[PDB]
Write a protein that binds this ligand. Structure first.
Ligand SMILES: [Cu+2]
Ligand SMILES: [Cu+2]
Lengths: 219, 222
């Protein structure tokens, strides 16, 4: 399973989005290696301007996260190889995201097909009002093991920067389970870093992504 | 599950829709009498004007409220699955794009829900569908139902007649498969059919793109 991430692997990402009766779709193309922990993706909104700000959709392909030589026994995301990634995103004082995504290989490209449903967001609120900065800070992904579902649970809170100077908290609860039968880890975490940019020659509503993710927690 | 449909039951309907790179969603609320075969629903396009004329969606947006007479109470697959069943369809529009449909129909307390997804493929620009050349009308149709021992469910085949502004007719071939969700004591039926009648109206005080529905469907063949 690990041997598939030895080098560059092309990425395909599709997102089915439904928030407060607004339907949108996002295509994601790019590359990424797990030896460095790098991701380079360009997301395109093929349905005009998004009804929600980009940074909220960032959180919803860990498998390209770098696991050091002494932690290679703890990468569920690679052992699967696919898995499904379910999430619930609690935006504080704001709506919520339910997310289900299948992540498997399709030949050369690694594919992440997503469906999300946004419920009870506030009009002229921080999300539906696009009062979010085009930013993203660094975060930790606290990962534990789940023997009951042969998978993994994880908890973290994302800090979205607001235009006024305050901070938005999007509490994330996620569950992952393998698709095919056939390695759960100990309590570790994934340190993440992210830059949001744009292609100056794309007229479509888009987002360029650069990520660096590594693991830690085990000496 | 006959006892559940004794009287009036509230209905909830949602349609996840994608047709030729265009996105839409539709909410449906209403009631239904299975003792009569009556349905009264009001659908709302929460996304604004659909990229597709309503009458092509009427077929895919709950065949449990159909009236099966007292001598046909052994042939209602739909009522008996209520856990619910999964209704899958493929709608071939003649000389036009097609529809692929999936839906889950189950009870969530008082109301009955169908959660539906659909994908539209290979439709023509300035066609009858994408060009909105269909009259806001509908005709009467028969639903021939057969048994599926292998998948423990049923199938159905029929062709829908959509009226065109030309005075012509746009055909839509429907193929469907139903399979129970929970392990069912549900009995399968002999070859029979449902006679359907639909009326599409508008709520005068609603500004959103919408459609009001009235349906009378009863079972026959025995
Ligand atoms: Cu709006
Ligand atoms: Cu959709």
């Amino acid at each position: 399973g690990e041997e598939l991430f030895t080098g560059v692997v092309p990425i395909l990402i599709e997102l089915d989005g439904h928030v407060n009766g607004h339907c949108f779709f996002v295509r994601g193309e790019g590359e990424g290696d797990a030896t460095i922990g790098k991701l380079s993706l360009k997301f395109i909104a093929t349905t005009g301007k998004l009804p929600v700000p980009w940074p909220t959709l960032v959180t919803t392909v860990q498998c390209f996260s770098r696991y050091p030589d002494h932690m290679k026994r703890h990468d569920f995301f690679k052992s699967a190889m696919g898995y499904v990634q379910e999430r619930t995103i609690y935006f504080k004082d704001d709506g919520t995201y339910k997310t289900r995504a299948e992540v498997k290989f399709e030949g050369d490209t690694l594919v992440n097909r997503i469906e999300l449903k946004g419920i009870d967001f506030k009009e002229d609120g921080n999300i539906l009002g696009h009062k979010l900065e085009y930013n993203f800070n660094s975060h930790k992904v606290y990962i534990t093991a789940d023997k009951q579902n042969n998978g993994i649970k994880a908890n973290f809170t994302i800090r979205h920067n607001v235009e006024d100077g305050s901070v938005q908290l999007a509490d994330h609860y996620q569950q992952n389970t393998p698709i095919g039968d056939g390695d759960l880890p100990d309590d570790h975490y994934l340190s993440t870093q992210t830059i949001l940019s744009k292609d100056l020659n794309e007229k479509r509503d888009h987002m360029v992504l650069l990520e660096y993710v590594t693991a830690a927690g085990i000496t």
